[PDB]
């Protein structure tokens, strides 16, 4: 069955979703209408020509009330408030909540009380009562009649998870932290201007902004057992795309790099076959664009310390390696509906 | 003497301006309060700390509604509709319009209204009803009683200005063309997300951005004799300040290369001593930071074709060189503030 999908906020996260899904062979969904703050004159555009994803090759045109992407048509609207949203009257099974505000457990349900069966989120799930799922982790535990308010989660937590998970079973984590050098997102000013994180106020193009996160306690979840074990943060930097993660984890089980990377090369034919990738090569960010993967590893860089200390590194397209777990998850729901 | 001043628009022409005023050894106005979509803490931080103009060297501090520099505690505000700005109540003779929004004649007035006396437009002025004055070019005819609603035009228009003039004086201009390469300014997007001018929507930092300008037909205002004679355009490249202008002008009084630059050095000191800096050296961007002049001719670049078709390149620090052509115009006031 097709579950019929709406998209709220045609953001980065929200325009990549559209390109990826709109790409695959066999899809189980049906995209129907999108709620950005923007005419259709403009959305055609930002979908058509991504600054990063390069020309998009497809039959795209717009009217005043929808965008047409190679044959198929979805309606576009300008409503800020979810509740005015004609969802029930559009048989909208699932909407995507990625304006990144209605990331609340509550508010994001304004979507529902606007018609929609279930609503998806693209950031962490703050406040109680909300589902989070790391595709190819706990993804095994999916229950339509569990939550109506799910969440793919931070661009970094989906990179994180399919890592620590893996180590916690092979060796076992006592505790860790991480940090990620990060593509510069849309929430920190182009220049030094007003803001609520004094750092973000600062021009990401010209600096190195570190910021807090709950991308780690975040792992302390879909991996139950990592309970208040790993934290840290991350720094953002003048690369418009693809970030990358240095993980620092203790363990209860000593090893040597050449194997550490072997088990990993393992989960790059098995349990994560399409979750984790692999470079024996020597690459550099721009090398991991268009990369349909959750966590990229550089074997090499990897490094053991005494046996009970493990430096681990993971690339990732913050914009896209995620808009394919969302797509994924989306189509997940779509298959275990009801 | 001591006329009272304040700032709606403590952001960029904001700080620059002020850091610039507290940076005069002899100054006419007392800037007293600042209204800013930030809190006090914040407006505090950013006056202080800069990614372009480094730090400020001054004793700084604050509470929950005021900010203190060397001595002058100034008042931090938080209101959007300027009518709801306590003007009257604080004898605010002079208002600074650096929000980049109230650049409507009509948007200017809502300061008079709420209760102010004179407001300054750090940009071109919209529609009928505003004096548009370029320092060292036509400031000749500032008279308090003329207009209470005045503009300092654009970073760029300023450049175009003195040069336009001296061009008119020594060889006089028939008609030309204008091409500013400009540095990104916070009205753009870091990376792609919606925006009504669809170039302005494109990732500022990684992307040559072309936009409209009338900042060149922003001539006549200051030059009666130059009515729609030289239309330009602009392109928005990846650097967060310092910009240069490309003129191109079919002059009538036939001429040669270094005889032009002759004049620029004549004027460089004659009339414009402190307006145009004159530069043969071989320099790039990071050499005009901290710079006070406005127009700044790269001489070693000028290029007269067939005696008639002059071409002259010109620098400027867009932020700063302006945040002085203001604090100059701004001073001009207190001396006829009748």
């Amino acid at each position: 069955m097709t579950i019929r999908v709406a998209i709220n906020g045609f953001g980065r996260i929200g325009r990549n979703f559209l390109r990826c899904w709109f790409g695959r062979q066999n899809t189980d969904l049906e995209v129907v209408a999108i709620n950005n703050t923007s005419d259709a004159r403009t959305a055609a555009h930002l979908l058509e020509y991504d600054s990063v994803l390069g020309r998009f090759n497809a039959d795209i045109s717009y009217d005043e009330n929808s965008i047409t992407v190679n044959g198929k048509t979805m309606k576009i609207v300008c409503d800020r408030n979810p509740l005015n949203l004609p969802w029930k009257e559009w048989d909208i099974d699932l909407v995507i909540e990625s304006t990144g505000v209605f990331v609340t457990a509550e508010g994001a349900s304004k979507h529902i009380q606007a018609g929609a069966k279930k609503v998806l989120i693209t950031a962490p799930g703050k406040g109680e009562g909300v589902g989070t799922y790391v595709i190819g982790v706990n993804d095994s535990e999916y229950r339509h009649e569990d939550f109506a308010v799910i969440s793919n989660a931070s661009c970094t937590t989906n990179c994180l998870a399919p890592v620590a998970k893996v180590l916690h079973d092979n060796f076992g984590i006592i505790k860790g932290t991480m940090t990620t050098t990060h593509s510069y997102t849309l929430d920190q000013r182009i220049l030094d201007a007003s803001h609520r994180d004094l750092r973000r106020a600062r021009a990401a193009a010209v600096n190195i902004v570190p910021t807090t996160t709950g991308a780690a306690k975040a792992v302390a979840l879909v991996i139950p057992e990592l309970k208040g074990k790993l934290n840290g943060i991350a720094l953002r930097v003048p690369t418009p795309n693809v970030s990358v993660v240095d993980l620092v984890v203790q363990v209860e089980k000593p090893t040597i790099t050449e194997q550490v990377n072997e088990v990993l090369q393992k989960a790059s034919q098995t349990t994560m076959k399409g979750i984790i990738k692999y470079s024996d090569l020597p690459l550099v960010s721009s090398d991991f664009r268009g990369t349909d993967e959750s966590s990229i590893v550089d074997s090499s860089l990897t490094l053991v310390m005494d046996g009970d200390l493990v430096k681990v590194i993971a690339w990732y397209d913050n914009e896209w390696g995620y808009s394919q777990r969302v797509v994924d998850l989306a189509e997940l729901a779509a298959r275990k509906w009801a | 003497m001591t006329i009272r001043v304040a700032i709606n628009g403590f952001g960029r022409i904001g700080r620059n301006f002020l850091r610039c005023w507290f940076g005069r050894q002899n100054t006419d106005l007392e800037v007293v309060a600042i209204n800013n979509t930030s809190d006090a803490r914040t407006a505090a931080h950013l006056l202080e700390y800069d990614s372009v103009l480094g730090r400020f060297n001054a004793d700084i501090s604050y509470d929950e509604n005021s900010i203190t520099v060397n001595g002058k505690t100034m008042k931090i505000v938080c209101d959007r509709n300027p009518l709801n700005l306590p003007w009257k109540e604080w004898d605010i003779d002079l208002v600074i319009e650096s929000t980049g929004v109230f650049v409507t004649a009509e948007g200017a007035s809502k300061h008079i209204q709420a209760g102010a006396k004179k407001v300054l437009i750090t940009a071109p002025g919209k529609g009928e009803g505003v004096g548009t004055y370029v320092i060292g070019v036509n400031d000749s005819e500032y008279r308090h009683e003329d207009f209470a609603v005045i503009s300092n035009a654009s970073c760029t228009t300023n450049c175009l200005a003195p040069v336009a003039k001296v061009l008119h004086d020594n060889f006089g201009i028939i008609k030309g063309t204008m091409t500013t390469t400009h540095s990104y300014t916070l009205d753009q997007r870091i990376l792609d997300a919606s925006h009504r001018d669809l170039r302005r929507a494109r990732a500022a930092a990684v992307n040559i951005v072309p936009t409209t300008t009338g900042a060149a037909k922003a001539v006549a205002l200051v030059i009666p004799e130059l009515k729609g004679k030289l239309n330009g355009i602009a392109l928005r490249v990846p650097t967060p300040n310092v910009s240069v202008v490309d003129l191109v002008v079919q002059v009538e009084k036939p001429t040669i290369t270094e005889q032009v630059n002759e004049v620029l050095q004549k004027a460089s000191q004659t009339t414009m001593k402190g307006i145009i800096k004159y530069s043969d050296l071989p320099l790039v961007s990071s050499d005009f930071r901290g710079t006070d002049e406005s127009s700044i001719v790269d001489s070693s670049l000028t290029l007269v074709m067939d005696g008639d078709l002059v071409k002259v390149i010109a620098w400027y620090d867009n932020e700063w060189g302006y945040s002085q052509r203001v604090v100059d115009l701004a001073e001009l006031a207190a001396r006829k503030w009748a």
Binding site: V101, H182 | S38
Partner: peptide, 23 residues
Amino acid sequence: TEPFFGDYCSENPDAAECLIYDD
């Protein structure tokens, strides 16, 4: 610290000011 960024960030959080991506 909510004299502002909160009574204002409660209201218009699409803003140039309030956008937090728990990244």
